[model samples]
Target: PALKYGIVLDAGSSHTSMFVYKWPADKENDTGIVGQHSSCDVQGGGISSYANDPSKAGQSLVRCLEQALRDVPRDRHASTPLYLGATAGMRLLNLTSPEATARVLEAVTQTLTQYPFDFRGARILSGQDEGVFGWVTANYLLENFIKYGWVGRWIRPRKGTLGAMDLGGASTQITFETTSPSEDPGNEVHLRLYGQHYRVYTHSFLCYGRDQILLRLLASALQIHRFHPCWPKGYSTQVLLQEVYQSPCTMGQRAIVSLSGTSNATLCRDLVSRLFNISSCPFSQCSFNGVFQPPVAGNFIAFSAFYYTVDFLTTVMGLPVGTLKQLEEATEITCNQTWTELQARVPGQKTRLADYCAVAMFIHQLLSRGYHFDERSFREVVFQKKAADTAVGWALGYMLNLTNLIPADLPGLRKGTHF
Candidate 1:
């Protein structure tokens, strides 16, 4: 009688996933009282892959939906709220074909409607929306926002909130709290939670994420020759013009050949540095590419690609942690190591292992030169792949916000907005 359920589907560029969450009855619940009941990653590419074959988009979610139906109690099936949102996957699809995007959304909606739960339909979330929801997720998990107090009431903390850094394929995002009016409009989010107003500054840097920027780097570095600075000396690979030129961010649709590595860490940084244009700013201050940002204050959480790369350096690779300087040193070591040595040194690995060297430099450049985190402030950044047993992303935050479960006025107080 105390538990209610909600489902959120995160349709990412690389893959899709579903999360079933259970919350206390709204009236009895305090702020941020939610937990993951179960989760499932759909088999196959994300919904965007079904563009040409639209009906399959709906079908792709079947297994996950079946699991959801079972995970949530049978009696409460009709009461469960289900929602889905897409990230850069559909954003890129829209560019390819707006009709395709619409068809895919319709296909997804059609299948979801068949489920017993109350389906809320699906839509493409803007990069700003992604940044905002993830910011909510991070701070919500940390309890930096309002929390239930031992005094039998919910309370706000003296420590304030946290900044959120989420990295993705087509874009990367930064959201932090600031009272100062943003010089650049449309970059700020104004919202109220638990009867408290929040002025959040957020922005997404398009074509700057790991995958997109790599395309640019490949495009530029390819102009030189077969030998490269980013890859390890013994490692070599082939690429096509279509791969690099596929993204609108990269220049023309042209050529590619073979690649062997020089493995020069110094040269790699110089090449990677070219991707950022931080020379001038039109606003009072800019993080990079002339985007508005107040200084990144408060403790911060860096997740997704941010956490994975940091984890590779700190935990998996067993590199010394603490300070951005150490990260750079570790990254340099990774960059300089030959591919042959790495295979023997680090075994039983999965993922884009060869790509870490390039990725580490990207992270380094993004934080130090782009966001301007110095030796001291860099310590303020924390990297995590999951929070409270739930994988990190915008899905839960979006669900929580939509449900109005964050406590508009906290327990023992009810202000505006009733749900």
Candidate 2:
């Protein structure tokens, strides 16, 4: 028999990724069998950027969908399901202008209709849904569920599973199954998959993303002085105060402030650390700004910008993984370099040096102080983009949901089953 296929479009803030997933039709109920058959990146920024020219949003996906058509067999074209779920970028867009967001979705829908595959609806996912699905994807890719039988759908697993941390361009999410009860209703998600139950707590910080945090710092610096310690020593640039100040994170008013900064590793960490206010917590424990959180829980898989920055520090700088002191030492060396000297070290990149330096410090502080991760146990947090060659993120879990991997109710039947 021919294998089954599904396609998912991860319309993220920075870029869009199209994944072709396949599984054997015979083992549809088995856990951890779905694999990515092929994948493609849509050319250009995310679909939200095309708000001004909505038609271009549809056009951007053509190249990738064409490739998908070639990869899947012709006989299964009509049966295959295709879905597009936009993340934080569209979430912000919809809040600013519901009309614009609708138009952009319509444009993409029109484009997908032209193709032969099954076109599922395109829409913006809620922040909580994004976080929860991401947790599902991470655990699924990690094969947290057990395989009891080849024919039975439900499977069991060990008591614990790894947590997930996804740091995107515009938002970051933390999700895990906590043994303790959570007081906050919004943060808790209850999931029962393959005969096992998971009580997961998830939270998505809207403006805490790497890019938005940088913008917050830049906006504040524009108001006071141009010399920012977070920037590389040799870096200096001019910027209009109005650009950074207009966001809700800043004063939301306009002004003129030049941005020129002298890089200081210690000062940079101090400045970025201010972004997280950890003074008050109504709950017994808090992560940042009184957001209730249980203990850090089990091991975590950090991906997206987390992987990018951590990989850069480890692969490029040759630093040991999970050593907080070594990471800090590396940050100092990178920030202390002059523009020319830094370029000579990395070669072919000029603007990214300061950005990387700042991001490196930001990641370290966020994990250590904000999340309260101790240095010794920090090694448990694995930084990777993929597991077993399959891209890791919410996309896989989203596809699994659409394909009905997660059942609505328990299988055994009773006459007039009561709640």
Candidate 3:
């Protein structure tokens, strides 16, 4: 079997990224041991940001796409499958203006079609698919999906697959296998792979990831018109109210306001806590926003923004924010720091330093209240950036599925039921 390559572009709200994956064309029971060969980050905002100038959206990906052309073998360039999936940003844009979404995708497709690879078309991914893909990518990278037994059959690990929690810029997703099926069919994704059935309970919350959630918080603070708890002391900035309401999650107001950081950790916690609504539940149990969820069992692998948060704490302050107590302490320490002290500590990263406090408190409240992970359960979470030295996200899973590398039936089986 020769090497087969597939390329996927993850057009996230905050940024876009390209991933190149390679595995043997011959299958492992029809599943490829997919690993990320290389990846390139698009040097601008998400594709949706080019709504005003849709052509720019396509142009933005050219540099990375050219890199892919050189990375893959010259012979396989035309045969390799290529795809692009837009996440929450496009999903939101689709609702606000369908025509704009169409143009952006059209621009992207036009550009991608020019490339030599097998262009699969650009489209907006449903929130459910995003969650499911992230989960599959995590488990596959962790090698929890299937293993070759003595007879060489694909088999799952006894320890079970790891759950995936993705915190993107515009949305958040959680997915894990459950012993029982979900009462809410909308919240469940039923898939058959490697001669097995998995009823994964997955949910995606739009406008709940790092960027949008902070917008919600910023919208809340404008009324006070002065000191902000989420911002560190000595920090002051000015922006229009449209900055908060520009997203679909919030309705805009017109005003120019000056903002200053008061740096109250306690108040910041309280403000961030208000973002999660767990009061009403019509089902047996619910996470925030009354979303039905079974208990979060076993260890979970968190990715993207979740990993970035911890990496930020560890790199700048020498603190590993793995435990609830550590996160809380970090939140407090970061919240109370003066802007000058933060500048001294985090050199050349001043742009994001201002949002660190809000992000810290946001993730803390999200786990504890949004998902109800107590101190003990919270400790079980591994904020992993990548597994097996490969970038972890939904793109690899997307390629696996598109390539039929993940099969519903066992290998050499003609039908769902094996004889």
lDDT to native, each model? 0.82, 0.80, 0.84
TM-score of each: 0.92, 0.91, 0.94
Model 1 alpha-carbon drift over 4 Å, by segment: 26-29, 147-157, 252-256, 411-419
Candidate 3 lDDT tens digits, 133-155: 88888877776655445343434
Root-mean-square deviation of candidate 3: 2.6
Best by lDDT: 3
Off by over 4 Å in 2: 147-159, 246-258, 349-351, 407-419
lDDT of 2 by residue, 280-322 (tens): 9898888897888788868889988889887877777776656
Arranged by TM-score with the best first, the candidates are: 3, 1, 2
lDDT of residue 346 for candidate 2: 78
What value does the lDDT take at residue 270 in candidate 1? Answer: 88
TM-score winner among the candidates? 3
Query: Which candidate would rank higher by TM-score, 1 or 3?
Result: 3
* Candidate 1 per-residue C-alpha lDDT over 1-419 given as tens digits, one digit per residue, 9 for 90 to 100: 57999999999776789999987784434555677889999999889888899999999999999999889999999999999989887888898789999999999999999999998879899989999999988777766665345454434443478788988777788888887778987797987776677899998887777787777777777875546788788887888767677776785423658877778899889888987889889988888887777887877889999988888887666797588889899899988988886666677864577778888999999999999888877888888868878777898889987776776565555433222
Error of 3 at 226 (Å): 3.1
TM-score of the candidate numbered 2? 0.91
